[PDB]
Structure formats: structure tokens, C-alpha cells
């Protein structure tokens, strides 16, 4: 069971109910963009729908195919949003196809919606009632002048992952440079072609033994030297 | 008509009631999938428990 | 936005169908709820006849808006100004008069 | 450990097979009636399964 | 509506078959 | 190992039935793993719900 | 629950389709049994004629309920009060009168 | 089982279609055989008119049977008592009389 | 390019269906915009009546162009010369006259 | 090849639809070209009435050709001999005269 | 009857594809 | 046009599925 609030359950039980609103939020902070809020309808006063303080904007967007099943493959829902005016194109050329960002979906009954929306106000307004679920954009299946279609996926997907993941190599270091495991923090020394330099912008390790010797960090070398003698 | 021992507070009209006989055995189940549908309904699949 | 000036011949058909979400349970019980926040929008169906010389003006007016721009019009049914858009229209050219038949959808935009 | 990894709405959860108590009861009035006229459809396992 | 409907349904069936095979090949499916 | 085999044998001997049905507008509460009870009047033959 | 106080015109059509479970393969032995308790729910096809001024009140009454809310109405056919819902209605505006067509569906809730 | 007492207006339509198994060979030769052991069943389509006061009795009679129970009736076509079931019916409520239209299928059960 | 010189009969039907791009899911926010430059192209449903002797000339004129070639024609609707193509036409032969029915579609090329 | 002798009553319908290969580009531009080398072929629809005694002769003539052989005939529309074939036909037998209905497709073979 | 028929046919095609794959998996089929 | 259309579409879907599997079986396909 999801820990749904009691008033939402009471609303679900009743025979005659209020409108069900889905409030889409597309988050591009991890990729490097801004977070965008969309909703399918305007409110009763012809203004953007106001939930808490967010004020989601009106825009034709639909998401279908959501499911909760662990027996077979992953779920892979689908989200369709229109770009007649070229917004999705502007986001995709810039933020590299909107691949990797988060999509958050909220389902709130219109009974609990904020009092700003209705012309006569709402006496039952309660901002705590919503049902939230998070997904991650996976691909842009289509992009046209009429619409654009994305396919979402679960944040925890196991398509390209292999467990042990760490390879024993004879001549190449697998660590990340200046990371936790390499443990190097000092002046810029060399380039990625083992050419001396001092600018901090173009300092990169070549993952070679000479590249590591430039740092005098041979102790933390990722690879295991002289294996190829035994493997032979 | 029945005559219950006590009437819980605020039992509105058109609310679900179940009769639990001692003879009959419960038929439990365990959900395995809940497919959200466009009409606003949910399809639920279960396996015996 | 420009306004529709010409008058409508009697026989206008106002068809309104709301959108609802229905679930039908076992013994006739059910759940009903509105689908959207906004109220429903009507679809006025009109017929109007104009002289041959004035047909060009009306045809050009409907042509310039295409099927994507909306214009103000005060239907005789309720006498309140609304925003309507005409996606398609037709005309039958007689000897003296031209008769237009078109369906004005209502849009909140 | 006989648990099925299912992605809940917000977090990845593991559902194990241990005895549990009921949650909700669904009678013939709570569930949707298809055009066929059968609210519940039961199926069984195969002989060789 | 004549054999043209049958041809269209056959084409749609083939497309669905390719889609289903590709869906099954990924992790957790029958072919994996 | 013996319990691992016995679990398969017992779960495939005891639990051999599945059900499929649709529940409208109040399925927000359910997630996989929930245990529910089915009171089917036609199956039992006596009126148990309303 | 509001009530419907307007008067219908001759020709009201009552269509009843009882819900029944029947199994029959080919021309074989056939078995029939009811689907539930409230098997028979009638849908009433009504027509209303009201003047130009009074059309707004009826239109507002039908629009305010939408397709979801149910009102009380006592049909002229059997004279027993029932709860109905109007999911669609069409108006045909004339010079002096307006003619309404609608379908009322009996509901248990 | 109860008996249908009310009378039928002229214009009854009796439609009887047998079920057969046909195989069409090459040059117009063929195989024909009856599908089942039992004889075919007709589908009488009747219409009848009753006053306003007596409409409720007939509607209640057809209602209590639902679409699953069969009642005896002697069609004027052949004057032999048979078993019929009315799956659906409709009525047009005029000012003085109500006109029913229904299809009585014949069942051997 | 050859021209059409015959005269049409009362009752020409000019059908206009502009090409537009609209996106709307359910009842939500709707967006519309034109599809191209020459969005609106009309099809004229004409009717011609010619004697028995002059039916051959009109039939030959419509046949030699086929459905591909386009000819100039000045519609009586707006009196501006356009390029049209006739893709289908049917003739109803009478004792002294022949009646033609065809659809001319405006084209850009 | 045998020639058709019997005469056709007024009301003959001549339907001709050419075959073209069309491609529609973005802004109303297009490509049009004929599909085949040969010119299109009309499909005359005729109606003729003959006495009861002469009906057998015409029926035998049309039955002899089946639906695969062609006979020469000079339509009143253009007065040039062509090759036609009748795939299907029907006749309505009155007290004194029989009226036939058939569609003579034109075939170049 | 519009795109709805196409969508329904697509769903039925996918169901048929799953059923056919499961049928072919067992003994004697292509995948066995 | 009733359930008969559904049954016919299902049969055509199964035929398409078999054809697609056999097509993908040969060289260059997914199953190769
Ligand atoms: S080669 Fe040495 S300095 Fe470079 S990443 Fe590996 S451990 Fe760090």
C-alpha cells in the first residue's frame, strides 16, 4: 500500500466525484537545464492551474501506459507532448535530446486544488493530498512539426549493467582522475598526450604508467603491471 | 433487514457491507500487476495465497 | 480579433455534449465525475444566405481565418459574446443568392 | 530469499513470500462488470507445470 | 471492406510481431 | 537446499489459482504484494456482499 | 437533488434492454439467467418545446448538472419518481420557439 | 408459467430462417444437410397498442420475466401454443394510448 | 493551356476544407496553426446540360486531358481565373439532352 | 463475334473515371501523370424492356457469353462500335414485359 | 473506422505475437 | 462488426507472427 491520505481515499470511495487532474513536471537540473511545469487544462478562470505555489502552465501533454508489474520486463511508459510552436525542438537541440532528465507526475483531485483557481474559492483546499511517481526519460521516439513522443523508464533499470564491473588490465588504469580512488590533488602537471603543461583547464591523465609517473602517484595505480607475461 | 449489535458512527447509505460466516473459509489473493487504464479503472491480477 | 457581422437564418442547431468519466459496477451502481476542470463547449451549426455580390466578402472573411484563427460572435441562442472557429464550410450558388452552411465550434482560446 | 523486485511508484521495493493479513475485500458490487457479464475470471495452472 | 482490409491488417500484424520480438529480447523477457 | 526445493514443491501443490478483475477509481491504494480477499457470490453460491 | 419541473411532449420513447447472461452454441441447448439485481434500467427519449426566453433556464439547468450529477424526475409513463442523468441534449432554435431533444437514463445511485 | 393475454395489431412479421451445413464443390455440385436434430424456431415480430391505464400492467408483466424467462402464447399465425421470450422491447407514449413493439423469439425450453 | 468555355447550371456546390495542424488531447488546451501556404483549395461540383450533338465535343475535351492535365476556367462564384483538373465525370443520356456532372479541383501547378 | 441488337431505353448512365498517379507535396504542389499507355474505358449502364416472348432470346444471348466473352455494340452516346462485356445482369418479370438491368464494361480485347 | 481501429488491431497483433512465441517455445517448435 | 472481426484479426495476427519469426530466422536477422 501507498500511504495515501485519508481524505483522498474518502474521495475515491464516493459515487459522484470531482475532476481528476494530472500535473506534469519535467526536471532537467541533472542534465543542465531548468525545470519545466506543464498541465493539460486551464482553470475555471482561464489562468494557469495553481497547485501549492507552482502554477503549472497549460500545454497539451499526455502520458499513457503506466503500470506496476515486476514479473516480466520493465514498464517503459510513454509520454506525448506537442511542439507546434517549436519548444521541444529548442530543448532538444540544446540539452542533447532531453535524455537523462527526470519526469515527476502528480494526481490530485480537483476538490483539494488551490483556492486561487476557482472564482468562488474552495473551502476544502488541502495542499498535502497528491500521489507522486518519478521516472527518467530514455529516448525521443519521434520529433515532428505536430508532436514529439518520449519513452520513460524506471530510475533503477538494469539493461547495460554487469555486476563485478572492474577489469584487471596490465597497462591501463581504470580509476577516475582526481577521484576518490586515485587520490591526487595538486598542481596541473601534464596533458593527455604526456606533454608538460601548467594550465589547470587542460590537465588530464593519460591512464598510462608515464602519465601516472608524472604525478609521482605510482602507488595508487589502478592496473596490475606485468600480467601479460603470465597470461601469455 | 438485520439488527446489528451497534451501528458504527456515520455509516452512510450505499456503503459496502460483507457477511463473514464462521463456516466459510476466506479466499485470499496476492496482487502481481496493476495496469492503469485510460477509462480511470485499474486491472488487478492476483495469485492464490 | 474581428467580429462576425452577418445574420443567421432560422434553423440553427445547437448541439452540446459534456465529457464525463463513467465506471459501471456490478449491480447497476456506478461512478460519475467530470473529465476536465473547464465547462463544456457547444457546437453551433448555422445556415445563412447572402446576395451574390456580398458572397465574396463572406467567403474571403472565412478564408483569411483559415481553420486556426478564432473570431468573436454573439449567437442568438444566449446573447453573450463568445469565441468561435470555423473549420470547414460550403456554399450553394443559386441565380440570385448564395447559401452558406458552416459549423462554428466554440473554443475558449 | 524468494522476493520479487518490483518498482514501486517512488522506490525499488522487494516483495517477499511470507504470511500476511488481508487488506481490502472486493465483492460483486465493487468491481467492474464487463459486457461479457463475468466480473472475475479465474484460471488455473497446467498439469505439467 | 474487401481484401484491402486484410492486407492492411497483415501489415499491422507484422509490425506488431517485430515490435514484440524486440521488446522480448531485452532483459527479463523470454528471449533473454 | 532441502527447504529451497520444498518451497517449490509446496507452492506448486498448494497455490494453483489466479484471478483477474477491474477496480475503478480506488486502485490508488494498491501496489504489488498486497493481499486482498475476494467475495464472489456466484462462486460461493450464497449472498455475501452488497 | 434538484427536480425537473418541465413538461414533455407527445411521443416520449421508452427503450428497455434487460441485462441477461445467455450461453448458446450454434442451435444447441440454451441457458439464460439474469446478470444482477437492477437489470432493467430504462432510457427515456424526451422532447421539450419552450419559448425563446425560457430556453436559457433549461439550458442552464442541464449544463450545471453536466453528465455526472443526477436529478429527480417523475416520468409521465408510470408516475414514480426516479433518478436520471442527461448526458447529451440538442436545441433547434426557431423564430419564436426552441425545441429540445434529450435522453434521460435511469440510475440507481 | 403465465400466459400472454393481450392482442396484436395487424402487420405481424414472421421470420423463419433454418440453419444448414453447405459445402460447394467445383462444378455446382454440393452437399446439404441439417445442422441439428431439432426443428427450426421462428421469430415472431409483433406490435400492439393499449390504453394509458393498461400500459403499466403490460410493462410490469414484461419486466418481471426479464430477458431470461419464457411465457406461453398462441400466435394467430398457426394457433398452437408455444414458448416465447422477449429479450427487448420499446414503447411510444402518445396522448391516449401506448404502442409497444417487441420481438418474441420462440424457445423449446 | 486550353480553357473551359461551357456554362454551368444553377446549383454549383463549392466545398472548402482548409488544411490545418491542430493538437488536442482529450479536452485540454488546444493549439492550431496552418499547414502551408496554399492551405485552402476548393473543389467545384458543377452540372452541365448540352444537346445530343454537342456531347461528343465536351466528352472529348474532358477525355484528352485525362485526370492529370490542367485547364483554365473562370468560376461564376468569384470571377477569377484558376487552374483546375477534372478527375471524374458521369453523363446521363436523355432523349434530346445530355446532362454532365463533374468535380473540378483547383491546383497550383 | 456477335452483335447486340436490342435497343436501350432513355436514362442510360455513362460513367468514366480515368486512372492517374498523383503525389501531393508540401505547399499544394504536386505531380500528375497517366497510369497506363492506353486511354481510359467507360462503363455504360443500360436499361431495356422487351416483351415476355422475346425475353428468352435476350436471356439466352447474355447467358451464352457468360462473363468472359465480349460482343460488339454501338452505344447511342457516340455511335462508334466498341467491344463490351456484361459481368452481371438482372430482370424483373411483369405481366406483359420484362425489364433488364445490366452494366456493359468496355474492354479493348 | 478511423485510427481507433488501427490501434485496436495493433493491440490484438501484439497479443497474437506473444501467444505465438509462447506456442513456438515448447517442444517441436522453432525455438526448441 | 462484432466479435467475428476480432477473431479474424487474431488469426491474421498469428499468421503474421509465424511469418515474421521465419523471416528473422534467416541470415542477418535478430535470431541469427
Ligand atoms: S594513472 Fe595514476 S594518476 Fe592517472 S588516474 Fe591512474 S592512478 Fe590516477
What oligomeric arrangement do these chains adopt? part of a larger assembly
What is the makeup of the main sheet of chain E?
A: none
The radius of gyration over CA of chain A amounts to 26 Å
Secondary-structure element order of chain A, N to C: HEEEEEEHEEEHH
β-sheet strand percentage of chain A: 15-25%
Number of helices of chain E: 1
How is the biggest beta sheet of chain A arranged? 8 strands, mixed
End-to-end separation of chain A: 58 Å
Q: Strand-and-helix sequence of chain E, N→C?
A: H
Largest interface (CB within 8 Å) is between: D-F, 30 and 30 residues
* Number of extended strands of chain E: 0
Number of E-state strands of chain A? 9
- Could you give the distance between the termini of chain E? 40 Å
| Principal-axis shape of chain E | rod-shaped
**Estimated radius of gyration of chain E:** 13 Å
Ligand set: iron/sulfur cluster
- Order of strands, main sheet of chain A, comes to 3-2-1-7-8-9-6-4
Give the DSSP E fraction of chain E (strand runs of 2 or more residues).
under 5%
Q: Level of helix content of chain A?
A: 10-25%
PDB class: viral protein
Keywords: Complex, viral protein
Entry title: Structure of the bacteriophage lambda tail tip complex
Chain A: Tail tip protein L
Task: Give a verbal description of the structure.
Chain F: It is found in: Virion; Host cytoplasm. Chain F: This is Tip attachment protein J. This is part of a larger assembly, with 1 copy of chain A (232 residues), 3 copies of chain B, 5 copies of chain C (109 residues) and 3 copies of chain E (32 residues). Chain A has 232 residues and is α+β, with helices and mostly antiparallel strands. Chain A is 11% helix and 23% strand. Chain A has helices spanning 6-13, 87-94, 209-213, 227-231, and strands at residues 20-27, 36-39, 57-58, 61-64, 67-69, 78-82, 102-109, 131-143, 147-153. Chain B has 49 residues and is an all-beta fold. Chain B is 0% helix and 35% strand. Chain B contains no helices and 2 strands. In chain B, strand 1 (28-36) and strand 2 form a beta hairpin. By secondary structure, chain C is mainly beta. A 5-stranded antiparallel beta sheet of chain C has the order 1-4-7-6-5. Chain C has 1 helix and 7 strands. Classes of the chains: A alpha+beta (232), B mainly beta (49), C mainly beta (109), E mainly alpha (32). The interface between A and E is small, with 5 and 6 residues. Strand 2 of chain B pairs antiparallel with strand 1 (17-24) of chain F, so a sheet runs across the interface. Bound molecules: iron/sulfur cluster. Iron/sulfur cluster binds at residues 173, 175, 177, 182, 184, 205, 207, 211-212, 215, 217, 220-222 of chain A.
Amino acid at each position: 500500500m501507498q500511504d495515501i491520505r485519508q481524505e483522498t481515499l474518502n474521495e475515491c470511495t464516493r459515487a459522484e466525484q470531482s475532476a481528476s487532474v494530472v500535473l506534469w513536471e519535467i526536471d532537467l537540473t541533472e542534465v543542465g537545464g531548468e525545470r519545466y511545469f506543464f498541465c493539460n487544462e486551464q482553470n475555471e478562470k482561464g489562468e494557469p492551474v495553481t497547485w501549492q505555489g507552482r502554477q503549472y502552465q497549460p500545454y497539451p501533454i499526455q502520458g499513457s501506459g503506466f503500470e506496476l508489474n515486476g514479473k516480466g520486463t520493465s514498464t517503459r511508459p510513454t509520454l506525448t507532448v506537442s511542439n507546434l510552436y517549436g519548444m521541444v525542438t529548442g530543448m532538444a537541440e540544446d540539452m542533447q535530446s532531453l535524455v537523462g532528465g527526470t519526469v515527476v507526475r502528480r494526481k490530485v483531485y480537483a476538490r483539494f486544488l488551490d483556492a486561487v483557481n476557482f472564482v468562488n474559492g474552495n473551502s476544502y483546499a488541502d495542499p498535502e493530498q497528491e500521489v507522486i511517481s518519478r521516472w527518467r526519460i530514455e529516448q525521443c521516439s519521434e520529433l515532428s512539426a505536430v508532436s514529439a513522443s518520449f519513452v520513460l523508464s524506471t530510475p533503477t533499470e538494469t539493461d547495460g549493467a554487469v555486476f563485478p564491473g572492474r577489469i584487471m588490465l596490465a597497462n591501463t588504469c581504470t580509476w577516475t582522475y582526481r577521484g576518490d580512488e586515485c587520490g591526487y590533488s595538486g598542481p596541473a602537471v601534464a596533458d593527455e598526450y604526456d606533454q608538460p603543461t601548467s594550465d589547470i583547464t587542460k590537465d588530464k591523465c593519460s591512464k598510462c604508467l608515464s602519465g601516472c609517473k608524472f604525478r609521482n602517484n605510482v602507488g595508487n595505480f589502478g592496473g596490475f603491471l606485468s600480467i601479460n607475461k603470465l597470461s601469455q | 433487514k438485520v439488527k446489528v449489535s451497534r451501528v458504527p458512527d456515520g455509516v452512510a447509505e450505499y456503503s459496502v457491507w460483507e457477511l463473514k460466516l464462521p463456516t466459510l473459509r476466506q479466499r485470499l489473493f496476492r496482487c502481481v500487476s496493476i495496469r492503469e487504464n485510460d477509462d480511470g479503472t485499474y486491472a488487478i491480477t492476483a495469485v492464490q495465497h | 480579433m474581428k467580429t462576425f457581422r452577418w445574420k443567421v437564418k432560422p434553423g440553427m442547431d445547437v448541439a452540446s455534449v459534456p465529457s464525463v468519466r463513467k465506471v459501471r459496477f456490478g449491480d447497476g451502481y456506478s461512478q460519475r465525475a467530470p473529465a476536465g476542470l473547464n465547462a463544456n463547449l457547444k457546437t453551433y451549426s448555422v445556415t445563412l444566405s447572402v446576395p451574390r455580390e456580398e458572397a465574396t466578402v463572406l467567403e474571403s472573411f472565412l478564408e483569411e481565418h483559415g481553420g486556426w484563427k478564432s473570431f468573436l460572435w454573439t449567437p442568438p441562442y444566449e446573447w453573450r459574446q463568445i469565441k468561435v472557429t470555423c473549420a470547414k464550410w460550403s456554399s450553394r450558388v443559386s441565380m440570385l443568392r448564395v447559401e452558406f452552411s458552416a459549423e462554428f465550434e466554440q473554443v475558449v482560446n | 530469499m524468494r522476493c520479487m523486485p518490483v518498482w514501486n511508484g517512488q522506490t525499488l521495493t522487494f516483495v517477499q513470500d511470507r504470511p500476511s493479513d488481508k487488506t481490502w475485500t472486493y465483492n460483486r458490487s465493487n468491481v467492474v462488470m464487463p459486457d461479457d457479464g463475468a466480473p472475475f475470471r479465474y484460471s488455473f495452472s497446467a498439469l505439467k507445470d | 471492406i474487401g481484401p484491402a482490409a486484410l492486407k492492411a491488417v497483415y501489415d499491422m500484424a507484422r509490425k506488431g510481431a517485430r515490435d514484440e520480438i524486440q521488446t522480448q529480447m531485452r532483459d527479463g523477457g523470454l528471449f533473454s | 537446499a532441502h527447504r529451497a526445493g520444498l518451497w517449490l514443491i509446496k507452492t506448486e501443490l498448494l497455490e494453483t489459482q489466479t484471478v483477474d478483475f477491474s477496480v475503478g477509481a480506488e486502485g490508488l491504494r494498491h501496489v504489488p504484494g498486497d493481499v486482498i480477499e475476494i467475495c464472489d457470490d456466484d462462486y460461493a453460491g450464497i449472498s455475501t456482499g452488497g
